[PDB]
Design a protein around this ligand. Structure first.
Ligand SMILES: [Fe+2]
Length: 316
């Protein structure tokens, strides 16, 4: 028994995660990693005999586009239904989220006080001129965030926001989320937007250098007075032509079960989807916050206008 996993997850803990699965079920995991868009293209180009059993992403919107293109097959699992909140899985059992991550404002403690922060929209304020940095618009975390702004504020307003946000950049987008945190820590900028688990990793690192970086940067959950902080998920679905549907289903059921949920929360610093599972202490220290649960099912359709907006605004 084996499954062919196509995953856009890119963490050093993924190997142990999959190992946990095999040690529990005896099912071998053949892994193919790459960026979400690349994996979807590969699957579609490989045809009806593609080896792909499971498609794993770190973005809800890409999962939507995958389901739209009919790449998944329905799965009805009692464990999936009970463990995964309805709003975090496909109404037709096409895909399911198994972790949650928040894209929040991370700021230099010495240069910024929390009282000066509020919403994502405010980051376009002239006050932040030459003090903001963020990774490239090509990244899905950013595209999904911009999509949520389109959904909540509209295309016209988001375009205006993006132009202002870009005008505030201290440097052109370079590096990943962690590179942004380090740059803010080093005084190259005062704030950025990154996923919570990246800060969790730095705070929990055995490398003193990483922990030192974390100490200079604080975390702020935006839009608390309104829709809430933008929350995305790491999701998964069984490919329609999966050669081993049985193993594929067991894999997804494994991901949402207590053992895997606890590991993901404790070792990869993400928010588990299963209730009753404790967060990593460092992540717990961020505090409680309101999550945006209303803009989720409309994010996918908003991808197109979001990317158009990011391009027009000059967000490289
Ligand atoms: Fe990530």
């Amino acid at each position: 028994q084996e499954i062919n996993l196509y995953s856009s997850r890119h963490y050093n803990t993924d190997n142990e995660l999959y190992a946990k699965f095999t040690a529990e079920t005896g099912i071998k995991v053949n892994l193919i990693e790459g960026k979400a868009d690349e994996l979807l293209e590969r699957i579609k180009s490989e045809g009806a005999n593609s080896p792909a059993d499971v498609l794993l992403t770190v973005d809800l919107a890409r999962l939507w586009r995958a389901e739209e293109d009919g790449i998944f097959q329905p799965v009805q699992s009692e464990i999936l239904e009970t463990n995964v909140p309805e709003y975090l899985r496909s109404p037709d059992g096409m895909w399911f989220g198994f972790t949650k991550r928040a894209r929040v404002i991370m700021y230099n403690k010495g240069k910024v006080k929390p009282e000066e922060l509020s919403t994502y929209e405010e980051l376009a304020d002239p006050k932040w001129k030459g003090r903001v940095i963020i990774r490239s618009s090509s990244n899905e975390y950013n595209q999904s965030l911009v999509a949520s702004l389109v959904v909540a504020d509209g295309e016209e307003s988001t375009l205006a926001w993006a132009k202002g946000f870009v005008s505030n950049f201290a440097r052109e987008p370079q590096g990943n989320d962690t590179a942004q945190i380090e740059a803010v820590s080093s005084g190259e900028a005062d704030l950025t937007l990154a996923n919570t688990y990246y800060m969790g990793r730095l705070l929990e690192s055995e490398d003193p250098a990483q922990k030192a970086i974390a100490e200079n940067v604080g975390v702020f959950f935006p839009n608390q007075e309104g829709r809430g902080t933008h929350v995305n998920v790491s999701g998964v679905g069984v490919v329609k032509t999966a050669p081993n549907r049985e193993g594929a289903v067991k894999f997804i059921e494994f991901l949402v079960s207590e053992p895997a949920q606890a590991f993901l929360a404790q070792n990869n610093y993400e928010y588990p989807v299963l209730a009753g599972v404790p967060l990593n202490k460092s992540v717990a220290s961020f505090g409680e916050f309101k999550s945006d649960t209303t803009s989720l099912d409309k994010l996918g359709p908003a991808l197109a206008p979001a990317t158009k907006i990011m391009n027009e605004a000059g967000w490289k």
